[PDB]
Amino acid sequence: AGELRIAVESHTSFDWLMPAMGEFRPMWPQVELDIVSGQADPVGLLLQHRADLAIVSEAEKQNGISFQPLFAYEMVGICAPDHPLAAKNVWTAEDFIGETLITYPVPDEMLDLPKKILIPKNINPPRRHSELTIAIIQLVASRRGIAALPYWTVMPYLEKGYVVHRQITADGLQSKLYAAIRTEDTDKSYLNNFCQIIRERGFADLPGLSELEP
Amino acid sequence: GELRIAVESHTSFDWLMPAMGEFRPMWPQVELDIVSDPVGLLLQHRADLAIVSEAEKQNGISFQPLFAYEMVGICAPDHPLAAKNVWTAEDFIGETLITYPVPDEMLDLPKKILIPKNINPPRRHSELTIAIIQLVASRRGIAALPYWTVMPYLEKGYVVHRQITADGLQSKLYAAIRTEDTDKSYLNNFCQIIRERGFADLPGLSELE
Numbered sequence A: 001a002g003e004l005r006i007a008v009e010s011h012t013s014f015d016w017l018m019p020a021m022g023e024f025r026p027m028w029p030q031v032e033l034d035i036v037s038g039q040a041d042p043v044g045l046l047l048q049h050r051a052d053l054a055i056v057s058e059a060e061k062q063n064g065i066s067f068q069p070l071f072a073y074e075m076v077g078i079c080a081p082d083h084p085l086a087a088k089n090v091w092t093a094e095d096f097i098g099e100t101l102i103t104y105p106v107p108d109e110m111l112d113l114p115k116k117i118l119i120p121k122n123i124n125p126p127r128r129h130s131e132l133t134i135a136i137i138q139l140v141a142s143r144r145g146i147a148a149l150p151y152w153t154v155m156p157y158l159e160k161g162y163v164v165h166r167q168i169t170a171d172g173l174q175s176k177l178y179a180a181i182r183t184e185d186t187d188k189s190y191l192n193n194f195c196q197i198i199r200e201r202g203f204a205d206l207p208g209l210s211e212l213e214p
Numbered sequence B: 001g002e003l004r005i006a007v008e009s010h011t012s013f014d015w016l017m018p019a020m021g022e023f024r025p026m027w028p029q030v031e032l033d034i035v036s037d038p039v040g041l042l043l044q045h046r047a048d049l050a051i052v053s054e055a056e057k058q059n060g061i062s063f064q065p066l067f068a069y070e071m072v073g074i075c076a077p078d079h080p081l082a083a084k085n086v087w088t089a090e091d092f093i094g095e096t097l098i099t100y101p102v103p104d105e106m107l108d109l110p111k112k113i114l115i116p117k118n119i120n121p122p123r124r125h126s127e128l129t130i131a132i133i134q135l136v137a138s139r140r141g142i143a144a145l146p147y148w149t150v151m152p153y154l155e156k157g158y159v160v161h162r163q164i165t166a167d168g169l170q171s172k173l174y175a176a177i178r179t180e181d182t183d184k185s186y187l188n189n190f191c192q193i194i195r196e197r198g199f200a201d202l203p204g205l206s207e208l209e
Helices: A011-027 A042-047 A112-121 A133-141 A151-158 A189-205 B010-026 B038-043 B108-117 B129-137 B147-155 B179-183 B185-201
Strands: A003-008 A032-035 A053-056 A065-079 A101-103 A127-129 A147-150 A164-168 A173-182 B002-007 B031-034 B049-052 B061-075 B097-099 B123-125 B143-146 B160-164 B170-178
Touching: A003 A011, A003 A042, A003 A189, A011 A032, A011 A133, A011 A189, A011 B129, A032 B129, A042 A053, A042 A065, A042 A173, A065 A133, A065 A151, A065 A189, A101 A112, A101 A133, A101 A147, A112 A173, A133 A147, A133 A151, A133 B010, A133 B031, A147 A151, A151 A164, A173 A189, B002 B010, B002 B038, B002 B185, B010 B031, B010 B129, B010 B185, B038 B049, B038 B061, B038 B170, B061 B129, B061 B147, B061 B179, B061 B185, B097 B108, B097 B129, B097 B143, B129 B143, B129 B147, B143 B147, B147 B160, B170 B179, B170 B185, B179 B185
Parallel strands: A003 A032, A003 A053, A101 A127, B002 B031, B002 B049, B097 B123
Antiparallel strands: A053 A173, A065 A147, A065 A164, A065 A173, B049 B170, B061 B143, B061 B160, B061 B170
16 A cells, blocks of 8 residues: 655654554554654655655645644753752743753754744753753753753653753743645545544643644 | 763663662762763763673773673564574574664674674664664564563564574673772762662563672
């Protein structure tokens, strides 16, 4: 029936994207599954015919791409309990100044905090890169810097007293997740079926999730 | 003082992170950090403790044993390697090898098995174990990971685990520090937490000497 090469914007998506692939496989034994890793702009890989489905944080309208809504969630600021930012209930863009920002090794274009908060306010703190969330949590806990991760990701580490979560902006920082595919592939049943599994699994297994329209 | 941790394998983080969580309240004065050979960074005064897969044996470095565990070969249940109970170096030929994006020097399978036998299969890189398991399950290639790491993915029926070599592939883990710092109580205390946590939370672990 075809092939499914998945392109993914955020490292956090893997946590829920991996069991979804596990559910998909037996249902579609003919579809050749793959993850495009070993980079860059996932919508760009769709256009280059390098990926068949892309998990993105924005549905920025463009020719030859159809965007399907998945879910929305809150981005929470994290610091050690003994960090001066724990005292502040609602963080601001300016609170990130003078602090080391711990993020995944990806550019600001693919990160909701610098993109929506820091960049428009002319804020560029020194960066620190880590591929693992597990590693970001202990860097933050050891007072090596602060970070911004989804509420559901942070959730199990709050229960251990490693870090304290905080609201970013009075309005609140929110991530909107979409699954993007080429217009030509909108006739493919398995691609719509993979998006169905994602929404089913997400809402059932992840806390603090909200529906979003196209 | 200060504790800047240097780590050789991506797998160590799974057990190294809760150990840091246990350490912190006991030593509030010790400044913790993770750096990015780990033994080389100790000598350059860039790291204060290094988690390594081999204890050989240089001036100004003291090696403390942590634990040893088995490296198991993983493949999809339908893969032709599932049929083989004990894999050999030669079984890796013609197969795509899925590893962490690190050179063969820091990987026990190519280092101890593949390289000495003149075996170099096409590589595939992934930072996440979660991602390696689904690539293997989707028949994108085969992998070699610790038994404890693979353990939760075996019940789910994604992959099957097999023995590498008749002898068996084993990883020996050590915590390395500078000889000067062997008087520091917190460094020995961090190694104590690692061993305590490891033997209690991880299956298929054995003591080193």
